[model samples]
Target: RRALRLGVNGLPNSLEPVNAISNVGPRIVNQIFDTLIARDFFAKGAPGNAIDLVPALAESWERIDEKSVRFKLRQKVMFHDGVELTADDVAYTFSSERLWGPEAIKKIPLGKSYSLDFDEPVVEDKYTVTLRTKTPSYLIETFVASWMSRIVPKEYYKKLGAVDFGNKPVGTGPYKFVEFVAGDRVVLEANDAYWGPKPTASKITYQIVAEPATRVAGLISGEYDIITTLTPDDIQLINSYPDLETRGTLIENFHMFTFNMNQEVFKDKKLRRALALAVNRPIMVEALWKKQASIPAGFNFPNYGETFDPKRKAMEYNVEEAKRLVKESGYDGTPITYHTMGNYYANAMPALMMMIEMWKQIGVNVVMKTYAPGSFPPDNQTWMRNWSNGQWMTDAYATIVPEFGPNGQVQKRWGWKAPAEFNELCQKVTVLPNGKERFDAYNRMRDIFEEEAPAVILYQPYDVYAARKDVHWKPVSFEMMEFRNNLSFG
Candidate 1:
């Protein structure tokens, strides 16, 4: 069989099991690694990505009261080295992540309050394992079933260190890592001895093409059999191509115009709310985005309809209202700078220009500040001293916990100081396992934020995925890329 080549926008920074953080780009590595339990097929309702809990290494699991969970392993699944996967390996993998993973529960501040005790994943009987938490955790099943919880080879990483595994990783997935040239290409050969369904193709090669134009060009020239990132223009162009298919879904993230509440200019909630209402999201969507994105009225995305409540209205464009609020706040047409990254999104910079014009109309002089993705974080950290810190924030998901919870990277990165009350509420929500109670707490927190208006909720972007006719894949909203179960090749 011929080799199947896949093209990603950029190369992953690393493939180390515990340290890999790049989204979309690093998902290519998933095919080369296997998770302990895979998503089981959903029988009814809006089946979520067919995420049924099937045993990859562990055959079954059960909750033991409220504070503990137990798992029964399948006897003879082997690692890449042919060593049988055992309960010890499972215990070791969880322990390793707890000890050293950058975003591990132990290291995260939110975990401190959530009764998440990862220090104790114990191996009981030969095929049995137990995990004890500080409190009842309802999300434990979904949490463990997540890709982040995938078991790694403890023996190999102990000797090689985390960085070495990035270059050469051993796993039980359908593919094996071959070679990776930094900022260039990653090659993977099909695992003929794979435990699961073997890949039909002999090999999969991933190339890094940073420039959108070049990426589209490569797709047009048939240099890539599959391409991961597709812009609006690229989407339209690909739609015209008979040999290619255009696919899209709302990514698990949202974009927002973050406010520096600490700044005197935006200290007033009314002023911030006015700023939120001033920008015309509908116009921005139609003009620059080809109406591809959905307006975000709240924290959740439309794709998560199970959790999302549409009746809740997002802030709307009200030019007169913005003028009234600004005047009330005593601003005399001061030119505030709006910061955004140039190459972050498909038409992000241009969309920002539209915002600048809109703000000017509402009696606010605005300046556009642009930076490369590499420099934007450092620039935002400078306290508006060397760089204009006010700008839009874009990420794949607007996960409430990751952004608002204590130790959330956003809080650390932006130096945001939360109220003691809000912090306490965040803690209560995490420790309380009941979904209704937790969601209620979250809603209360959202209400507080709505009144405070620390950030302007903008729109959730529709992820555009383009691929060749010979390949088959689905756009994953939550994890950035489709896992093995969500993909196939004809």
Candidate 2:
């Protein structure tokens, strides 16, 4: 009957999964909502601490064709509102109107990050549904059913609507929503009638404390059983205490500083390459990450399975070459502006200072500016900004095409226009599946990306999670905290 206290460093902007801005929200959302198809968090996979996919809400599924798939649901799954989960609910969760239809998507934009496109979710029977896509879609198996696709109650959502539902949510997850106070805390309790494994803790409260030092203080004072959002400084402090400890893994997400190609100064490839060479990822890894994390060798990442190239030169820190290019490319002090968010990512400010020093050494006149998250927009003044890319889906296409590809995610934000060669390679890599052909295309695409330098890759992030010794759990990848099935009391 004891309550589990999770001292979260920050609270999410919205309770709705699609509308949630911060990565911290997903952990809270996942506890309140079950994903369409669950990932096996226990099993570890490549690139970083990512895992394999397993069936959850949908008991079984079969690829009907390259463009269609049929999924059978588990009957009698209970939602918090005492409604039985049906095939209609499963289909409705991914329906166009609910997720990505018309002006619906304009309101809720992060849903596009899933990169999921299906024609319709047709109900086959009471417990069966078919997902059909227009093209020979590759996402019929994996991307469509990722953790981003959390199953929502069809009728409940329509009744309450997005605003109401997001504020007062209901789901068929291990935990049931109790109450939420914005910028304060979100409380949830164990669903006793949960179909799967019940939570060890009877109650769970996500206590929002923005300061890492304060969160750690709460943990030491018995106010919290666990805490995340710790910096390397906090990690050292937490490990110093015998009763307290920190747990973490090499996350699949890699940090980077993306360039704005729309800028005339950044338009030169030699300048881009010179700027890329000025970044020292290894130094950042040592100074910020404290030598715990690694430089992600796979530009496309190991999630490509067969296609990830390990031998490729992901490292490009050369001071001499950077100086030479800065001179040869007709370097003039153009006052390049580097913008980033303050303390949003751990050691962000510190990294910015370090990188500025690095760039200054190479004869590049750089200006540092820190802006609030979501406030900064790319204009003529914007040159480079700190960003992070994750290996979410199961292929090289996930990061490559959507990020570096022409008119992709970052391109829309940063106004980065990939050259014809990069554009053609992105198109060529799309159709080819996980094989030698795909790998070749991915390698060529990576080469183009390096030459073009839309972004300079940094080290893989190590998310250090702190908890009291008595509260036991393993760290989940992609910024998730698993207290539902993975936690226990000693």
Candidate 3:
């Protein structure tokens, strides 16, 4: 009857899985909603593989053809509202204008990259559904298994409407929503009639503790069972405690500064190149992140297999060359505004200050601007530094599609347009299977990204999670902290 208290950085913008934007929200949604397919976190194929597809709501799926997949829904599955989950729900959840209305679709936090892969879901029978895609994509299965494709109760959603549904959502996962107090906490009770393995804990509470120190404090004091997003220093401190333990694994999330390519100041490739060279990535990794991050080889992480070119070097830290490029580009004293959020990432402000100082040494006028958490950068801002996290699909194509595609999620926010060549390469990489041809296409795309310098990728951070020793759980390498069948009290 005891509750598993989890202290997180922030509350989800909305409980609606499709609309949940922040890292904290999706973790909660994972417990409440079940996707068509699921990531095989415990797969023995790779050490920390996230791409292996497993069954969730859909008991099994088969590739009907090159562009079509048929899914068999799990029998006797029931939503939190006690409604039997059927193929009709899957069909409606995928194609409903109400769930994915223009405004709702636009608000999708992760961008519409994966959603664009599927055409519509067709109900074949009471427990069978078929999905068709516009193009034969190598990432279709992984995308369906991701958080973006979480299954919702079709009738319940339509009856409650989007806003009400988000406020009080229902799904067919191990946990059911109990109450949500914005900026405070979210309460969930274990679903007694869960189709899969039932959760051991009777209740779970996600408390919003934005301050890292406070979250650690809550854990040490036994007020919380688990806490997420711990800094390196926080982990060391937690490890020193008797009952508290620190857990973490390498994540695909990387920090970078994206340029507003449409801005006149950033239009010059030389300036962009110079800025990229000016950054001391090694120093940032050592000083800011305490060497807890790996310097990215390129825009994509090396774990992405074929997409990442091991031989391709990232822009090196050469102050002299940066100075030369600054002069060569007809140096002007106009200040370049770098916008970012302090609480968005660990040591974000300190890192921004270090970069600003480094740019000043190279005679580049840099202005530092900090925004409120969850706010987007202004249109005129020349550059915005932030964190970018990849989904379950660690493929190179998956990372680039939403970042540099024509309607790239961040590209639209930064007012930058993807070059025709880059867009073409992205499209080519998606359709090609996992082979030399696809690898070659991905390498070409990486080459374009290096040449274009749309963004300066710094490093991928090792995600740190903290929990009391009494709580039995193993954190996955991927950024998600799922707590359904995974977590229990000792």
Candidate 4:
């Protein structure tokens, strides 16, 4: 069989899913282990159509009560070490996480009032396991779908410990660990005895290509079979070549303008509303993105998902209105600074410069600053806290828990405290499963966020990637891109 070689944007830190907090973690661990449930297979799956959490090691599962869930494991699945997969392993995995993986586990909404009472995930039998939560939560499935909860072999992890386990991971997926070079590449071989459909290729390789131009060159020269992080210019160039094919999906990504609500200058809702109308999204799409974008219709949801409202109007450009709002907010020509990472996104520096020039034409004072990847961590440190209090990025997963949960990241960023009315409505909505009532409640929450006008919502962007036609491949949209599913060699 032909070796399926793929090139990725950057290097993965480690293959251990439990300890994978960075962007590279998802890129690596996604192939290392198979989840009990999975998102849609295609590049993009419609709302509620993308997930299939049927049985992997776990055959089937159901909620036993309001605060508990029970799972049944399959009979013959085994780890890399040949030990049988069991509920005990799942329990032990959660137990180890309580001791060493606290930060990763805290990302989930499981009740852990104190350090000692962190959790009590129990193995009821060889095939049965149960999880009990202190607080009532309706989104347990979301927690299970998290990267932290991914099943790993308890015996092997104990033998290697955290340091060694991260370097050499053992998973029950269709691929087995072979080699990893830090900041360069990770190689994996196909698992012939895989419980699911086996991969057709003998080996799969993830090569690091940080530069966009280099990645494009690699794709065209046949140095690499597949690559992601493509620009509009790159897409246009690739389309001209018959040997290469460009594919993309309208995932939950956006380019937004975030205001520091903590700052006095942008605290006023009127000022935010004015700034929202000041920048024209349509022009940005046509000129910079080469017309490969969608204009956002609202502040709080992706256009294609269950949360989007077809009737909502897009925020249009109104220079006169922007100036009036700025003046009303008592701004005396104070310059507005927009901060973005230099190495974070594709063509980030150029995009920010374009926005700066546009704002200048509207008589608004704006400055741009860029930083390297290591310089700024994805956290709320004193400096980052002050910086993120007002800025926005592509808001994918806006309707997910992080937008409105009790300890949501966005809620903390915007200093949004749920009022009694909103809180009561959220509680009512949680009780009902997927329904019009739930969607209406989400709409109300979106309206509340719009009233605050904490940030300007822009268009959802398409994640562009390129692949050579010689290999049989399909783009994956659920959790970045994967080379394991339906991935066939020529």
* TM per prediction: 0.82, 0.90, 0.91, 0.79
Clash tally, candidates in order: 8, 0, 0, 8
lDDT of 4 by residue, 1-490 (tens): 6776777766645566655633345656766676655544442543322543445566788988766678787777867667778887777665635332355344322222111112468788988887655555445554555454567887887787655777898888777788988767889888787888776778778887777788888888888878876667678789889888887765445556566555666556776676666777777777766787666666544432464567776556788877777778776766776666543455565666766676676666777655543354433321111111110111212233334445444456555444556556655554554568777776676565555565566666556778877766665443355555556655
On TM-score, the leading prediction is 3
lDDT of each: 0.62, 0.75, 0.75, 0.61
Q: Candidate 4 versus the native: TM-score?
A: 0.79
lDDT of 3 at 371: 70
The C-alpha RMSD of each candidate to the native structure, in angstroms, is 5.0, 2.9, 2.6, 5.2
Runs of candidate 3 with Cα error greater than 4 angstroms are 44-51, 96-111, 374-383
TM-score of 3: 0.91
Order of the predicted models by TM-score, top scorer first: 3, 2, 1, 4
Task: Locate the minimum summed-lDDT window of 10 residues in model 3.
Answer: 98-107
lDDT of 2 by residue, 246-316 (tens): 98877767778877777777776788889888988888788887887778664767656766787786666
Q: How accurate is candidate 2 locally (lDDT)?
A: 0.75
lDDT of 1 by residue, 1-490 (tens): 6677666665655666545534443366567666666654332433333434567666788988766778898777666777777777777666635342345443323323222444468789767888666665555555565545566677885677666766787777777888888768888887777777667667888887766677777878989777765656567778799888877765545666675555667556666766766888888888866788777666644433334456666655789988998888888776776666544455556667788788788787777666553344443332121111111012111255546556564355454566666678766765675456665665666766666666666676666767887676666544345435445566
Which prediction has more favorable TM-score, 3 or 4?
Answer: 3
| Total backbone clashes of candidate 4, pairs 3 or more residues apart or in separate chains | 8
Give lDDT for model 1. Answer: 0.62
Residue 245 of model 1 has an lDDT of 80
